[PDB]
């Protein structure tokens, strides 16, 4: 506090009210644009149709290919690169399959060495990727 | 300009104590200062003091002992209710054992101990510990 008068309440309050906009997280929440620009539109997961598979080349010192898949959301029609996590999980995901898509973890920020991939696949046509990987469920033929 | 007189009186005592002086000169004396310093003296943080009397605002020469750590003002003078003495003296004072909050009540100017004793609120002026 700088001004300390016993009736400087609207001053201290109005000052703080204005200066909270300079906070990066506050503004990102309280302005519309972040939510308006977010492909999920402020949701936990989202279902989307697989339209092709894509090999994303990893970042620097790391040298590998990432088993990403290009997905179109049902509710928006926005197009999304979703990372299929575990070792050779891309073989259970064929095209025109609807997938359930989560965020990666960092709340709309690219995770690890995978350049510009926010999302990851968790289900493939009402079957968990963990289930199809560990051999608990088979794909519905 | 000089807007708080008790603020400068207590800061000048504090610097004199830290520096290790035996006595200090307070320039513009007032009832509130003399009533603050009598509360200090009554517990025995300062010795005697002599208010030098020109035809203006007086001056005070206070006999410092070396048993005062800090004497500070609280501006603005907030309206301390009786149920708020605890949460004031919790964060202002060093311990629950020593230190005092002098606050101006209807009765007069006195510490949190006597304000609790007489069952009275008032306004915080400062603290000494």
């Amino acid at each position: 506090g700088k001004c300390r008068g016993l009736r400087t309440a609207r001053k201290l309050r109005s000052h703080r009210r204005d200066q909270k906009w300079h906070d990066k997280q506050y503004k990102k929440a309280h302005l519309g644009t972040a939510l308006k620009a977010n492909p999920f539109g402020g949701a936990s997961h989202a279902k989307g149709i697989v339209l092709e598979k894509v090999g994303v080349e990893a970042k620097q010192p790391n040298s590998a290919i990432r088993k990403c898949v290009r997905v179109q959301l049902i509710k928006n029609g926005k197009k999304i690169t979703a990372f299929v996590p575990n070792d050779g999980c891309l073989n259970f995901i064929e095209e025109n399959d609807e997938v359930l898509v989560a965020g990666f973890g960092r709340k709309g920020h690219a995770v690890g060495d995978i350049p510009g991939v926010r999302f990851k696949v968790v289900k493939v046509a009402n079957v968990s990727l963990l289930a199809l990987y560990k051999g608990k469920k088979e794909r519905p033929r | 300009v000089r807007m708080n007189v008790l603020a400068d009186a207590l800061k000048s005592i504090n610097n004199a104590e830290k520096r290790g002086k035996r006595q200090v000169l307070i320039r513009p004396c007032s009832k509130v200062i003399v009533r603050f310093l009598t509360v200090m003296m009554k517990h025995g943080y300062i010795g005697e003091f002599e208010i030098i009397d020109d035809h203006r605002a007086g001056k005070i020469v206070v006999n410092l002992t070396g048993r005062l750590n800090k004497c500070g003002v609280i501006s603005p003078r907030f309206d301390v209710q009786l149920k708020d003495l605890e949460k004031w003296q919790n964060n202002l004072l060093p311990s629950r054992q020593f230190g005092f909050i002098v606050l101006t009540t209807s009765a007069g100017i006195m510490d949190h101990e006597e304000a609790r004793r007489k069952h009275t609120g008032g306004k915080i002026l400062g603290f000494f510990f």
Binding site: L6, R7, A9, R10, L12, R13 | -
Partner: protein, 143 residues
């Protein structure tokens, strides 16, 4: 002097055609220790909405502001000042609420800056619900 409007202005309670061979006046003390002032009893004005010489009963609140504007017909704007207390910062903020209040021609000379006491009555107009009951001339104002 009076009877400027097209309809005949009279205190409708007093009857002024008693055969014989001064006009009388109806008034009232409006309670709560307010002295029915001299102009109420010894004036010749007509007012529906005067608390003394009219049909309004004072009941509910008794508030007080300072006279701000006197530019409308038998009505004035008072300005009521108070300190609203914000809780987070243990400090106040200076607020105001100015209300249109009915001034009787009873109180002959009030100056903008005078202190007024107002009594709640029934709704008199769109925004008027209070009546001027006593005026206290602002600090000095002798000359």
């Amino acid at each position: 002097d009076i009877q400027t409007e097209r309809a005949y202005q009279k205190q409708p309670t007093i009857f002024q055609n008693k055969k014989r061979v001064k006009l009388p006046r109806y008034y009232k003390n409006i309670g709560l220790g307010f002295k029915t002032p001299k102009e109420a009893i010894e004036g010749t004005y007509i007012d529906k909405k005067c608390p003394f010489t009219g049909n309004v009963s004072i009941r509910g609140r008794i508030l007080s502001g300072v006279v701000t504007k006197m530019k409308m017909q038998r009505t004035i704007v008072i300005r009521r000042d108070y300190l609203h207390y914000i809780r987070k910062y243990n400090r106040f903020e200076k607020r105001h609420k100015n209300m249109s209040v009915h001034l009787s021609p009873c109180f002959r000379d009030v100056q903008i800056g005078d202190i007024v006491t107002v009594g709640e009555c029934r709704p008199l107009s769109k925004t008027v619900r209070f009546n001027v009951l006593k005026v206290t001339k602002a600090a000095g104002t002798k000359k």
